[PDB]
Amino acid sequence: MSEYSQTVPELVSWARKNDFSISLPVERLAFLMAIAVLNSERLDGEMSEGELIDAFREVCKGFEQTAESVAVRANNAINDMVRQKLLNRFTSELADGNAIYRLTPLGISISDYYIRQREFSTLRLSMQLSIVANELHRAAEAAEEGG
Amino acid sequence: MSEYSQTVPELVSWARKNDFSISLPVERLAFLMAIAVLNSERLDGEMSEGELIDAFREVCKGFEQTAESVAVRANNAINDMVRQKLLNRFTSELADGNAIYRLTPLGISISDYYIRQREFSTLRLSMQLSIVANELHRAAEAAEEGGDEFHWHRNVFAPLKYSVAEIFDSIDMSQRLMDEQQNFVKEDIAALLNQDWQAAIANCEQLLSETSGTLRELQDTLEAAGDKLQANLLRIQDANMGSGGSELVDKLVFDLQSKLDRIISWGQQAIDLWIGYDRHVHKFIRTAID
Amino acid sequence: SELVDKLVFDLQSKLDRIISWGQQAIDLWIGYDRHVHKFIRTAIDMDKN
Amino acid sequence: TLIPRSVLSELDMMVGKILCYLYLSPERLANQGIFTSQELYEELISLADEGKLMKFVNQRSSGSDLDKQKLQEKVRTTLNRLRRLGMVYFLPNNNNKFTITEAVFRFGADVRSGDDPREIQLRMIRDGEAMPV
């Protein structure tokens, strides 16, 4: 099965029906990157709403924006990130009504592309080729053993 | 040195200075996905300007849009994707001025999130844990064998940094995918209860039990492998401390231990959140039945 | 197994793409390198006073 | 003046200064003066800021081939205007090739003397040779 089971017209019809969209102006993109850095420094990989509002406050200061209504703007930004599938929101009764937030695979890929200093390494490539050569060799020996 | 060398204020200042922004409305996102699909069907991983324009025409047709100025619109869309760092353009004198296009790591990551049907697999996790266990065991043996800085860099640091760290990142991504799948099941339970709650009680109990079983199987697989992995990371740490102690290997082993603790803690936290939702849905069902 | 054959074919197609990309990148870089060297030589050496 | 006076466009100037450098270039003197529109275009893009110059063809240009062909066609048009001014002569049977004349040196009037550019420019506007934009 082709990794992409759908033809271009089917994909376009499917995308149109689900109304998928990404809108990340410079401030929202910076908020996403700020969340990613804060999450990487933590032991639980989880963020509280108060921590997200504080992170957004730090971004607003960096955009020289007024501290007025920062909480409302932060909540709108958080809701927008959840709506765009960048953040997963978990509301547990056990967490005393406090919502927990975790970055989605999309939010991590976008944030890593700009923040992770990815440089091409010949050593990295040589290692990857060594692992795949061993994995392919084992798979070939297993295929030849039959079963 | 922390993979992310920049503090949040330095990063926000850097992002503002570079004016980075992503604006992908439904039509632009559909076009990115169409390009990603067309690129995957090719032998050279390269697309010409005419082929991209033909792809944009098919998207405009799918959106029932006017055929007027489509060549201009396609050029604006192509320039927008290049300007947003989704496409790399190669202009060679040898190609008589014809530009060659390739998707960037960002454009591929965004298109794959929507097109690639990523399902959490206990088999994928078991395979990834098997490969990392073998890699950590080889790195631990090499660390215990001892050697020079070159032996430690090639046989201990390189495998931990370019293999073990990448597999842990892949496992974390799979956990984030499981988080999204749980939210999908929650939406389905809320929908089944909103349509016909009496006929949905049996279906909701089955979805709740199956999700609980999968989370438990995953946590059991992670706890069973996690101890062996932690033991190998500790073996490397002890060997490093005995052979002088490279601060780079120690920091990397500490980062891997922290990532491993996050991976193990996530499973327990996901189970606790799921238990809370399960109790809430059962309470709601009891209140609705009463 | 049709599943294994298709998967092997896909991996072979990916490997061919990975090998082909390197040669193409070298040709593009060579075109630019020649052009910059020609430009520098023209700028430096052909004006003599 | 009893006779009207007019000024050239900035694209005409870009093509004019490039035609001037082409005339001087001993590296291409072996052609015996015969140049091709493509060679002119290649030299121009080699020196000026391509993507910033593209702003004059269209305000939305970002390196698309349609816009690159549009630039080439504007160059083709302006070059034809310079031919009417007597600054370049097309071949008798081939219109893709042409020959230069010394009249192009007027495009170097801002640098022929190694002095302060501002003062030169002032002198030129005072003499009626050139206007700003």
Numbering used by the authors:
A (entry chain C): 1 to 147
B (entry chain D): 1 to 290
C (entry chain C): 246 to 294
D (entry chain E): 81 to 213
What do the study authors state?
The SMC protein MukB dimerizes at its ‘‘hinge’’ domain, which connects via the long coiled-coil ‘‘arm’’ to the ABC-type ATPase ‘‘head’’ domain. The heads are bridged by the kleisin MukF, whereby the C-terminal winged-helix domain (cWHD) of MukF binds the ‘‘cap’’ surface of one MukB, and the N-terminal middle domain (MD) binds the coiled-coil ‘‘neck’’ of the other MukB. MukF also recruits the dimeric KITE protein MukE.
All three conditions enabled the reconstruction of a state with engaged heads, and we pooled the datasets to increase the signal and obtain higher resolution (STAR Methods). The resolved state was free of DNA, and the neck gate had opened widely. The neck and head regions of MukB adopted radically different conformations from what we had previously observed for the apo and DNA-bound unloading states of MukBEF. ATP binding and head engagement had triggered the detachment of the MukF MD from the MukB neck, which resulted in a swing-out of the MD of about 180°. Detachment of the MD was facilitated by the mechanical distortion of the MukB neck constrained between engaged heads and aligned arms, while the MD swing-out was stabilized by the binding of MukE to the top surface of the heads. This surface is formed by the engagement of the heads upon ATP binding and is a highly conserved DNA-binding site in all SMC complexes. Our structure reveals that occupation of the top of the heads by MukE and DNA is mutually exclusive, suggesting that MukE senses the DNA-free state of the heads to open the neck gate. Our findings show that MukBEF employs a dedicated mechanism for opening its neck gate, converting the DNA-free apo form to the open-gate state: (1) ATP binds the heads and leads to their engagement, (2) the neck distorts and releases the MD of MukF, (3) MukE binds the DNA-free top of the heads and stabilizes the open-gate state. This mechanism ensures that the gate opens only when the heads are DNA-free, which serves as an indicator that the complex is ready for loading.
